[PDB]
C-alpha cells in the first residue's frame, strides 16, 4: 500500500462479555497492544478517508532550511585592507532547526540540493553606485588547496566544480549526490578517531570525542570577481539545504536543552526545559 | 509450556529464569553474519562462534534509595572478558550482535522499576561549559565497571588541571533528550512485581558493514530507576543488579599486532 492509500476502516463492534480481554497488557514486555477503538469501545462502522501521505519521510524534509550566512565584500580602491572572500566548512550542525530535524534519526542517506540566495548593499555616504556584480561559488572537496588571496591560482577552477551567479538573476541551484564515504551518514559518532597507545606520547595520541571526521563534506568558497569599485559594496550569501530522496534508519528522541557546540554538551544553568503546572489543575 | 519461563543457551553457558517476560529482538532483525553482497573487506573473516559467544558477567551493582542510575558501553565493557576481548584487541575490524540479559531479583514485598534501554550511538555530555568535546579516552571507556548518572550538573572550575570527565544528567539521559522519550529506543522494563529479569537481542546497527571496535562503540545500555526502590525497613534497603552479555555471530576480519591502549 502506497502512502496515499487510505487507513483501515473501523469495523462495527457490539457489546461483549467474554474472557477475550484486549485491554490488559504488560509494558514490561516492551511491546504495546495494537488495539483499534472498536476492540474496547462500542463503535459505529465508518469508512475512513484520511491518509498518511503527508507524514512520509520524503515529505518531512521537503522544506529546505538555511545553513549559513557567508559575508563577502569588494572594498574601495583607496583602502589598504584586503578583499574579504569567505570560506565555509560544509556542515548542518550550526543551525538548530535542520539539526533537530536530522537528529531525530541516527543514520541517513540523502542527496543534497543546495540553493544560494545573494544580497548586497552599500556601506558609505557616497552614491557612486557600482555595476551589477558577479559572484563565483566553488566546491573545494577535502584536502584540496583552500585559497589564500582572492586572485590566487586556486580560483582557476581547473577541476573544482564551480558556479557563477549574476546579481538580479534567479537564485542559483545545484544538486549534489550522496557523497559520504560510508554507506550512510552518521549524525552521532560514539567513538574516537585515534586511540591513545602506551607507546605514544601524551600529545600524539589525543583526539576529540565525537569528531568522526575533521573535514567530512568539504569546503565551500565564494568571492566577488569584479575589481575594486571606488565605493565599498558588501554582500551576504545564504545557502539553503534541501534533502532529496532521503532514507533514515534509527529513530531517537529529539533534543530539549538548547544545543551547545558541534557535540552534544549542554550549557550550565539552561538545563530546565519544563515549567510549572499543578498536578490537580486542568 | 508458558511464556513466563525462558531458557537461553549460547556456547557452553546457559541462563534459566522462571519470571521472564518475552524477549525483545531490537528492530525486528535477528543477528546474522555478513552476506556476500554487503562485505567490504576481502580478507578471510574469522568466525570464533563457540569460542567467544558465551554469557559473560560484568560487575555487580548496588541499587539503593540514593542511587541514580548506571550506564555501559559495548563492546568496550567486554574488553577484559576473555577471548572475545583478546580477539577485539588483536584485530582491526570486527562486528557482533549482543544478547543483553539483566537480572535483579527481589521478593514480592519490594517495589520499584528499572528501565533497561539500549541506545545506538550513546553519546554523553562533558564536564565543562568550556572545552566542548574534550573528554579523554581514559574516562570515556570505563570498561566493565561502568559509569553512574548524576542528579545535577557541576562543571569543572579548574582549567589548570582539567578532569576531562563525563557529567551525564539523569533526567536528560546524559545527552539532552528528555527521559520520557527514551522509550523510542528498544527497551524492556523491570517491575519487581511482574518480572525479575529482562533481555534484549541487539543486532549490529552501524553505518558501515564492519567497523573498528576499539575506536567505536555501537550500542550503549542504560539502567535507570523509573520508580525508586522501596521497602518496609527505613534503614537503607539495597539489592543487587547484574548485567550479562553474550556476543552473537561475531566476526573479526583484519589481524594486526596487539593493541595496548593507555588506560593506566
Amino acid at each position, epitope marked *: 500500500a502506497t502512502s496515499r492509500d487510505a487507513l483501515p476502516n473501523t469495523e462495527a463492534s457490539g457489546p461483549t462479555h467474554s474472557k477475550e480481554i484486549p485491554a490488559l497488557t504488560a509494558v514490561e514486555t516492551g511491546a504495546t497492544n495494537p488495539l483499534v477503538p472498536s476492540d474496547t469501545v462500542q463503535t459505529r462502522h465508518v469508512v475512513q478517508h484520511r491518509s498518511r501521505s503527508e507524514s512520509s519521510i520524503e515529505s518531512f524534509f521537503a522544506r529546505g532550511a538555511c545553513v549559513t550566512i557567508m559575508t563577502v565584500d569588494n572594498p574601495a580602491s583607496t583602502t*589598504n*585592507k584586503d578583499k574579504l572572500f569567505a570560506v565555509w*566548512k560544509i556542515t548542518y550542525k550550526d543551525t538548530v532547526q535542520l539539526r533537530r530535524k536530522l537528529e531525530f534519526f541516527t543514520y541517513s542517506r540523502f542527496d543534497m540540493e543546495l540553493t544560494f540566495v545573494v544580497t548586497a548593499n552599500f556601506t558609505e555616504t557616497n552614491n557612486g553606485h557600482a555595476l551589477n556584480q558577479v559572484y563565483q561559488i566553488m566546491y573545494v572537496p577535502p584536502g584540496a588547496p583552500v585559497p*589564500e588571496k582572492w586572485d590566487d591560482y586556486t580560483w582557476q577552477t581547473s577541476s573544482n566544480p564551480s558556479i557563477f551567479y549574476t546579481y538580479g538573476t534567479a537564485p542559483a541551484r545545484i544538486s549534489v549526490p550522496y557523497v559520504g564515504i560510508s554507506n550512510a551518514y552518521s549524525h552521532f559518532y560514539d567513538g574516537f578517531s585515534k586511540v591513545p597507545l602506551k607507546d605514544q606520547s601524551a600529545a600524539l595520541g589525543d583526539s576529540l570525542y565525537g569528531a568522526a571526521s575533521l573535514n567530512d563534506f568539504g569546503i565551500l568558497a565564494v568571492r566577488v570577481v569584479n575589481d575594486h569599485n571606488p565605493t565599498k559594496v558588501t554582500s551576504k550569501i545564504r545557502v539553503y539545504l534541501k534533502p532529496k530522496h532521503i532514507r533514515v534508519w534509527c529513530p531517537r528522541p529529539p533534543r530539549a536543552v538548547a544545543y551547545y557546540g558541534p557535540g552534544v554538551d549542554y550549557k550550565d544553568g539552561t538545563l530546565t526545559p519544563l515549567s510549572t503546572k499543578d498536578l490537580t489543575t486542568y | 509450556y508458558s511464556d513466563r519461563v525462558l531458557q537461553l543457551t549460547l556456547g557452553n553457558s546457559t541462563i534459566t529464569t522462571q519470571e521472564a517476560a518475552n524477549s525483545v529482538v531490537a528492530y525486528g532483525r535477528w543477528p546474522e553474519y555478513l552476506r556476500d553482497s554487503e562485505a567490504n573487506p576481502v580478507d578471510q573473516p574469522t568466525e570464533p562462534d563457540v569460542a567467544a559467544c558465551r554469557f559473560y558477567t560484568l560487575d555487580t551493582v548496588s541499587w539503593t534509595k540514593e542511587s541514580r542510575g548506571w550506564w555501559w558501553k559495548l563492546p568496550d565493557a567486554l574488553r577484559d572478558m576473555g577471548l572475545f576481548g583478546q580477539n577485539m584487541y588483536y584485530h582491526y575490524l570486527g562486528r557482533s550482535g549482543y544478547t543483553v540479559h539483566v537480572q535483579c531479583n527481589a521478593s514480592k514485598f519490594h517495589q520499584g522499576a528499572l528501565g533497561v534501554f539500549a541506545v545506538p550511538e550513546m553519546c554523553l555530555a562533558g564536564d565543562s561549559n*568550556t*572545552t566542548t568535546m574534550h573528554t579523554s579516552y581514559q574516562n570515556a571507556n570505563p570498561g566493565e565497571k561502568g559509569g553512574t548518572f548524576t542528579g545535577t550538573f557541576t562543571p569543572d572550575n579548574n582549567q589548570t588541571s582539567p578532569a576531562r570527565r563525563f557529567c551525564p544528567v539523569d533526567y536528560l539521559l546524559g545527552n539532552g533528550t528528555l527521559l520520557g522519550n527514551a522509550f523510542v529506543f528498544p527497551h524492556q522494563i523491570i517491575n519487581l512485581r511482574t518480572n525479575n529479569c529482562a533481555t534484549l537481542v541487539l543486532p549490529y546497527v552501524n553505518s558501515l558493514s564492519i567497523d573498528s571496535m576499539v575506536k567505536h562503540n555501537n550500542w550503549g545500555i542504560a539502567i535507570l530507576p523509573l520508580a525508586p526502590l522501596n521497602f518496609a525497613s527505613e534503614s537503607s534497603p539495597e539489592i543487587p543488579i547484574t548485567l550479562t552479555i553474550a556476543p552473537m555471530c561475531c566476526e573479526f576480519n583484519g589481524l594486526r599486532n596487539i593493541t595496548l591502549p593507555r588506560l593506566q
Partner: antibody
Amino acid sequence: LVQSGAELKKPGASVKFSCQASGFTFTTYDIHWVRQAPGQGLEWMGMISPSRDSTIYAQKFQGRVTMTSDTSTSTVYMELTSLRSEDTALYYCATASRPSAWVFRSLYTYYYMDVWGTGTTVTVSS
Amino acid sequence: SALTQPASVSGSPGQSITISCTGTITDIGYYNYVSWYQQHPGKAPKLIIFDVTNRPSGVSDRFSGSKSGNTASLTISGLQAEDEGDYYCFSHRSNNIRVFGGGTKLTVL
C-alpha cells in the same frame, strides 16, 4: 589610531585602565585587552564588544578584571578590582578589524587583532 | 595552558629556519584561526601571518607557514639581520577563549 591613559604604581588597591578609539571602529569592532609582563610573553585578558556590550573574560582573571564601555566618547574602561605583585606588567589595548576568510560558526566573521595601542605600565609594590 | 614554542632559535644570514608552535587538541587542530605575531624591543606587536598560510599587506614574502595535525610552524627563508626579535603564536581555544604562545627569540648570527 588608538589612545590610552596614564601609568599607576600604588600597591594592593584597584586600578582603572582607559582606552579610546575612533567612532567607526569603536561601534563596529570588538576591543581586546592583553598584558605583557617583562620578558614573559603576551597573555589574553578579555574581549569587549561595544556594539552589543557582551563581554567575555579570560579564566585566569575572571574575578578581578571588570570592563565597561562609553558610547559618547568612544571609550572603554577596564578595572582590576584588586592587584598582586604578579600584575606588575605592561598592558595593551587592541582593536580587531582584519577579518578571517573562514566563517565562524556559520553565522559570524572572525577578527584578528591588528591595531595595537601604545599601552601603559603598572606597578604593584611599596 | 599556553601554546608551546621553542625558547630561542638562531641562524646565520641567508639560512632558512623554522619556528614550531604545537598546540593541544582543539586549538590548532580543530580550528584554522591560527596566526603569528612579531615584536621588536620597545614596540607593539605586528601581524605577519593571519590565517594558516595567508600573509597581510606590507609583509615581505620571505615569511611562510603551514599546518599539520596539532602543530603549525612559521618558516623564514633567507633570514636577514632586520628580522631579529620576538615571535608569538596565537590561536582559538575551543568555545570563545583565546591563547598566546610562550614566544621565541630569533637571533641572527
